[PDB]
Design a protein around this nucleic acid. Structure first.
Lengths: 215, 449
DNA sequence: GGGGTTTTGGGG
DNA sequence: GGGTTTTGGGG
DNA sequence: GGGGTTTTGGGG
């Protein structure tokens, strides 16, 4: 490892979504460049881009210590996040591009200040962290681990297909769904037997901060 | 009527629309630049402009359009493109043809090989050796006098690609030097493996003439022609300094992965000279977590050409889909979540051929009766796991473990090797490439180790 | 001027 | 044109 | 009519 975000998000997943177990020397202020502000607010760390999730307090505070400096116009300008936390959430990855395998690591922003001071930095083209090979693989490991535990807890009694069923199958026909086994004690068709406690924390929809600034 | 001119003879003075036939040796993927403009840049050649005196020489073609669909998708180097109404000018010493497809210019792609890339993928025959497999606008017309032009250029294309590298050493960078580059670069390597990372993404395991191995993400929709064992040219890649566990190449929306026509001397030599590497692997088997995928099994040579069938189709559609119903032998990929019976010692049971019954190896004719619980990319998100069997009483999969059946309660050596195999198979990122036979509603592994 | 189109002569 | 969209897992 | 082009008002 170099990408602050990649390291931060990776450590989160490698510690069952527990932000208290992630290295303390990584919970320092985050100086990042704003790649986009609308319709999607995306910031980079010089290697990847992620979507910051602002609390209602975060914007109100910002809108005070920085009057008239609109947030939805921060494009191509740096911001410094002084107070922030990381949560894990279940989402529809087919709808949220800043996620993978229906899982998302969110950067909860409590307080941030703008630095319009001709802030620079020559960087590689920023890419979606949730599209990175290694990170995707990390999230897969995470799921594989949860899936394995659930299966080794749910599946028992060695219910092996009786040998006769497949060793004398000349006059025998069967349905392939006979080979389908439930991996856990789920409710629907999606695997959800995880053990990290899905953090909640209310956040603002990017459009709301646009109306609060230009109805 | 159209008059076709040769690349080197095209007029640089008369900024008038000119037409030509040429061989495509390189091209970006059609990409967007703003809200109404899409661009595709390619390098073209013909009998009058193909070699600097040694590295390859060429002209450049820049096609402009207002819609992604109005531009050519170049999957393979060596095919032929016909262009109508292009203006030629000099750009930094090179002959550059510009064509606005959004106005009056047009293009048509002709296959140099028997079938086009897409036709090879779908196993279709070409309507005729004079039919464009792709073209802009609703129609494309080919005149009788054009036939000789096309047929001759094809012949020339094969001679050219068979006696020259075409994609010369100056057109790409050795993978073991990738990290020394300031920005993007090109690569020429062999695809050692295609790993279905997920529903929309393929992960290519590459290795070029320098011996270095690299991985890169290749979207299924964008590059559906990637095949293991084939040599490709990657247009524009960047070294990923954030990838730690493995060497990764980053591609952009304009990046392109291109194969070579059958006659390619370069592709032929790289296919043979570059041999499969398992080193990047080997090291993993010693780690508690491998970010690198590991394909543990190899299918019998006679099946190497057999197409694969997802778990989704195998277990959810095999009793409804017409095509899957007429087949009893499939090939598929997956990872093992759990192996039953839990006790490795009970993997081998005694079998009574007459009563069709098995028993604990406390007694019988020895056989494997293992039941794998698997899952794959196509079923990654559901709450299921699927049963794949290794019942060898009839010979199917008898040598899967490279351990002949034996009483595992007594043969310590056999029990140990199977225990080790069990840990590898259930380890994250471990996968199995296998052929299965459908019997009475179940799938049995065969011709796999 | 010339496409495709319908505007079938005439804008920006 | 050897580049950078959003269709934000062809673009 | 409207694009892209320049034909800058007018063909078929």
């Amino acid at each position: 490892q170099q990408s602050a975000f990649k390291q931060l998000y990776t450590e989160l997943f490698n510690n069952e979504g527990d932000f208290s177990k992630v290295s303390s020397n990584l919970k320092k202020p985050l100086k990042c460049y704003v790649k986009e502000s609308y319709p999607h607010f995306l910031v980079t760390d010089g290697y990847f881009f992620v979507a910051p999730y602002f609390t209602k307090e975060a914007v109100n505070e910002f809108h005070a210590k920085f009057p008239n400096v609109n947030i939805v116009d921060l494009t191509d300008k740096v911001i410094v996040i002084n107070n922030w936390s990381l949560e894990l959430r279940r989402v529809n990855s087919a709808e949220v591009f800043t996620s993978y395998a229906n899982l998302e690591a969110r950067l909860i922003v409590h307080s941030f200040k703008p630095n319009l001071q001709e802030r620079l930095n020559p960087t590689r083209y920023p890419v979606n962290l949730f599209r990175d090979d290694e990170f995707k693989t990390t999230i897969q490991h995470f799921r594989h681990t949860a899936l394995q535990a659930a299966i080794n807890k749910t599946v028992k009694g060695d219910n092996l297909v009786d040998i006769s069923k497949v060793a004398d199958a000349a006059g025998k026909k069967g349905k392939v769904d006979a080979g389908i086994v439930k991996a856990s004690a789920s409710k629907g068709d999606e695997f959800s037997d995880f053990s990290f406690k899905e953090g909640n924390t209310a956040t603002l929809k990017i459009a709301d901060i646009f109306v609060q600034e230009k109805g | 009527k159209y008059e076709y001119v040769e690349l080197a003879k095209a007029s640089l003075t008369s900024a008038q629309p000119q037409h030509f036939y040429a061989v495509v040796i390189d091209a970006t993927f059609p990409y967007k630049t703003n809200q109404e403009r899409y661009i595709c840049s390619l390098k073209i050649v013909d009998p009058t402009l193909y070699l600097k005196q040694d590295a390859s020489d060429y002209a450049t073609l820049v096609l402009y359009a207002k819609r992604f669909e109005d531009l050519p998708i170049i999957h393979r180097a060596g095919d032929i493109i016909r262009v109508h109404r292009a203006t030629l000018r000099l750009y930094n010493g090179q002959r550059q043809f510009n064509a606005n497809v959004f106005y009056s210019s047009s293009w048509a792609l002709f296959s140099t090989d028997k079938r086009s890339v897409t036709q090879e993928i779908n196993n279709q025959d070409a309507v005729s050796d004079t039919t464009p497999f792709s073209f802009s606008s609703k129609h494309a017309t080919i005149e009788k006098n054009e036939i000789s032009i096309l047929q001759n250029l094809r012949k020339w294309a094969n001679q050219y690609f068979s006696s020259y590298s075409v994609i010369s050493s100056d057109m790409y960078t050795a993978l073991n030097k990738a990290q020394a580059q300031k920005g993007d670069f090109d690569v020429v390597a062999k695809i050692l493996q295609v790993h279905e990372l997920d529903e929309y993404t393929n992960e290519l395991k590459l290795k070029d003439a320098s011996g270095q191995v690299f991985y890169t993400l290749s979207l299924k929709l964008k590059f559906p022609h990637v095949r293991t064992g084939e040599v490709v040219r990657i247009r524009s890649a960047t070294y990923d300094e954030t990838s730690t566990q493995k060497k990764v190449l980053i591609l952009s929306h304009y990046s392109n992965i291109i194969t070579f026509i059958q006659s390619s001397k370069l592709a032929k030599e790289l296919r043979a000279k570059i041999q499969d590497d398992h080193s990047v692997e080997v090291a993993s088997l010693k780690k508690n977590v491998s970010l690198n995928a590991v394909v543990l099994t190899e299918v019998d040579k006679k099946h190497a050409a057999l197409p694969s069938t997802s778990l989704q189709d195998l277990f959810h559609h095999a009793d409804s889909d017409k095509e899957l119903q007429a087949q009893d032998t499939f090939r598929t990929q997956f990872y093992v979540t759990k192996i039953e019976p839990s006790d490795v010692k009970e993997w081998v049971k005694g079998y009574d051929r007459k009563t069709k019954k098995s028993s604990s190896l406390k007694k019988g004719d020895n056989i494997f009766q293992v039941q794998f619980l698997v899952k794959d990319a196509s079923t990654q998100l559901n709450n299921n796991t699927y049963r794949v069997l290794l019942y060898t009483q009839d010979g199917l999969g008898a040598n899967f473990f490279n351990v002949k059946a034996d009483n595992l309660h007594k043969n310590a050596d056999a029990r140990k090797k199977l225990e080790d195999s069990a840990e590898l198979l259930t380890k994250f990122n471990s996968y199995v490439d296998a052929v299965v036979e459908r019997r009475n509603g179940f799938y049995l592994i065969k011709d796999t180790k």
